[PDB]
Ligand binder design. Structure first.
Ligand SMILES: C[C@@H](O)[C@@H](C(=O)O)[C@@H]1NC(C(=O)O)=C(S[C@@H]2CN[C@H](C(=O)N(C)C)C2)[C@@H]1C
Ligand SMILES: [Zn+2]
Ligand SMILES: [Zn+2]
Length: 233
C-alpha cells in the first residue's frame, strides 16, 4: 500500500518531508477506529499536526520521529478538542513540545476532557490564523473555515507541497455519512467545507482524520452531504 507499521501505529509517506500518522482506538466497547494526523519535517525540526488517541500512542509517534527523523519536535498543532486529535497532550508536554490550538479548542478542552494546549491561536475575519499567535510555523498554513464538525475545527495546508489537511471536517469522496455530528453545526458545515477548499485552491492531496488521502472530490462530497443534512426538515 505505502503504509508501514510501527508498534500499533501506521505511517505513510506523502511527500519527501511529510508523513501521515495513524493510530487506532482501543477502548473496550468500540471497534479499532483509525485517526490520522501529520508529521512535517521543516528542515532541522519537526512539526506535528494532531496527537494520537492516547498519551501512549502519542509517545510512540515521538519514538518513530526520534528513530526515523531524529530532529527535535519544535511544535504541535491540534485541530479540535476531541480525543482523536488532543488525546495525547500530556505526552507532548512531558516531552517539552510547545503546543498550539484554536483558542476556542483550549476553552472547550475542560468540558471535553482534554488537556488544553499551551498557546492559543486566533483568527482573522477571513479565517486565516493571526500570525502573531502562530510564530515560526514554517510551512504550516493554518485556516479556520468556520463551524462544521465542531465549532473549533481548524485546518492546515503545507506550503511547498500539494497537501491540505481537513481533520475531521472532511470525509472521503465515498463516505456514507459525516460521522459524529453530536458537536456539529449543521447550518454552517457545508459552507465551512467549501471555505476549506477555497483557502487551499491548489491542494490536490486532501488528508483527513478517518480515511486515506483523497482528491478534491472529498471536499465537494463533504459539502454535499452537509447541505443534505441542513435541508432535512
Ligand atoms: C471521539 C472523537 O474523536 C470523534 C469525533 O471526532 O467526533 C471521532 N472522530 C469522528 C469523526 O467524525 O471525525 C468519529 S466518527 C469516525 C468516522 N468513521 C468512524 C465512525 O463513523 N463510527 C461509527 C465510529 C469513526 C470518531 C468517533
Ligand atoms: Zn471530532
Ligand atoms: Zn475524528
Amino acid at each position: 500500500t505505502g503504509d508501514q507499521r510501527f508498534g500499533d501505529l501506521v505511517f505513510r509517506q506523502l511527500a519527501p518531508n511529510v508523513w501521515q500518522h495513524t493510530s487506532y482506538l482501543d477502548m473496550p466497547g468500540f471497534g479499532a477506529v483509525a485517526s490520522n494526523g501529520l508529521i512535517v519535517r521543516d528542515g532541522g525540526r519537526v512539526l506535528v499536526v494532531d496527537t494520537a488517541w492516547t498519551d501512549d500512542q502519542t509517545a510512540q509517534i515521538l519514538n518513530w520521529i526520534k528513530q526515523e527523523i531524529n530532529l527535535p519536535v519544535a511544535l504541535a498543532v491540534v485541530t479540535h478538542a476531541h480525543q482523536d486529535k488532543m488525546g495525547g497532550m500530556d505526552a507532548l508536554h512531558a516531552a517539552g513540545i510547545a503546543t498550539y490550538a484554536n483558542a476556542l479548542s483550549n476553552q472547550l478542552a475542560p468540558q471535553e476532557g482534554m488537556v488544553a494546549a499551551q498557546h492559543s491561536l486566533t483568527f482573522a475575519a477571513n479565517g486565516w490564523v493571526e500570525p502573531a499567535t502562530a510564530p515560526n510555523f514554517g510551512p504550516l498554513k493554518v485556516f479556520y473555515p468556520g463551524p462544521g464538525h465542531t465549532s473549533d475545527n481548524i485546518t492546515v495546508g503545507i506550503d511547498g507541497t500539494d497537501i491540505a489537511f481537513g481533520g475531521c471536517l472532511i470525509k472521503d469522496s465515498k463516505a456514507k455519512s459525516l460521522g459524529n455530528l453530536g458537536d456539529a453545526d449543521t447550518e454552517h458545515y457545508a459552507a465551512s467545507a467549501r471555505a476549506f477548499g477555497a483557502a487551499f485552491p491548489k491542494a490536490s492531496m486532501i488528508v483527513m482524520s478517518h480515511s486515506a488521502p483523497d482528491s478534491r472530490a472529498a471536499i465537494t462530497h463533504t459539502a454535499r452531504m452537509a447541505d443534505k443534512l441542513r435541508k432535512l426538515x
